[PDB]
Paper text:
MINDY1 and MINDY2 are members of the MINDY family of deubiquitinases (DUBs) that have exquisite specificity for cleaving K48-polyUb, yet we have a poor understanding of their catalytic mechanism. Here, we analyze the crystal structures of MINDY1 and MINDY2 alone and in complex with monoUb, di-, and penta-K48-polyUb, identifying 5 distinct Ub binding sites in the catalytic domain that explain how these DUBs sense both Ub chain length and linkage type to cleave K48-polyUb chains. The activity of MINDY1/2 is inhibited by the Cys-loop, and we find that substrate interaction relieves autoinhibition to activate these DUBs. We also find that MINDY1/2 use a non-canonical catalytic triad composed of Cys-His-Thr.
P138 sits in a hydrophobic pocket formed by A141, I142, L204, L208, F229, and F320 to function as an anchor point for the Cys loop. Based on these observations, we predict that P138 modulates the dynamics of the Cys loop, as it provides rigidity to the loop by anchoring itself into the hydrophobic pocket. Hence, the mutation of P138 to alanine should dislodge the hydrophobic pocket interactions and result in a more dynamic, flexible loop. To test this possibility, we determined the crystal structures of the MINDY1 P138A mutant on its own and in complex with K48-Ub2. As hypothesized, the absence of P138 results in a less-extensive engagement with the hydrophobic pocket, resulting in a more mobile Cys loop, as suggested by higher b-factors of its residues. In contrast to the WT enzyme, the P138A mutant was readily modified by UbPrg, thereby supporting our notion that the P138A mutation makes the Cys loop more flexible to reduce the steric hinderance to Ub binding. Next, we determined enzyme kinetics using fluorescently labeled K48-linked pentaUb, which revealed that MINDY1 P138A mutant is a much more active enzyme with >10-fold higher kcat and ∼3-fold lower Km compared to MINDY1 WT. A chain cleavage assay with these mutants shows that disrupted anchoring (P138A or P138G) increases chain cleavage, whereas increased hydrophobicity of the side chain impairs DUB activity.
Residue numbers in the entry: 111 to 181, 185 to 369
Amino acid sequence: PDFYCVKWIPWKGEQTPIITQSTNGPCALLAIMNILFLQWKVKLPPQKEVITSDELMAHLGNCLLSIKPQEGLQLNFQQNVDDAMTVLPKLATGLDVNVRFTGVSDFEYTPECSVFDLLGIPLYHGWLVDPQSPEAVRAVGKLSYNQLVERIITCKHSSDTNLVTEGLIAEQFLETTAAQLTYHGLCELTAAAKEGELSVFFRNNHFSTMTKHKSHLYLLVTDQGFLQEEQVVWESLHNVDGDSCFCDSDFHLSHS
């Protein structure tokens, strides 16, 4: 959990490095930092076999601090920086996000949110309510999965089944849509999702590098296991659940 292993993969023309989580924690630095290496925003000596939470960290800070501003955020930006810079070292350990269920770019604002909101990197999650189920739209509203828990516990105690009825039928929406994704979220995600531009995906307090390529949603292979395999580069999110096909950089299929 201290060091990290480099996959070294031919991508977009040249030999490009990438990082592999084996521990598989609430680990979002590997997920962001990855993006930067692809974007070639951070170059690594061709040599490098390994890298530390230390290396990765300081690499990101020089990368954030090298953002000159774009006129939304004006001197609002100047605090967006301070916010992020300060909760930067947080990313090393891990970071909960309060996911909203309204939309796939909808969260309660952590100040760790500010790192993405500054690196022009989108964050998305799959855990959306289904307007193809009316009770949720009403019985969940704009509440978040840290604010819905607080609320379900309030309803379990209200002597008024008018608002226990909700408190039951929220308990449904979790003790069912456990996998933090719905078919609905998954579809709606591809909707928002710009082709070919890389992003980050939240699920079960766990972070993934993402993209849409030929209008399907393919993630990266942050798994250390498939490691000598340069051609094994993207897994699919073609499906609500099941199995996924693997690819080389150019999104051609590959086999062990």
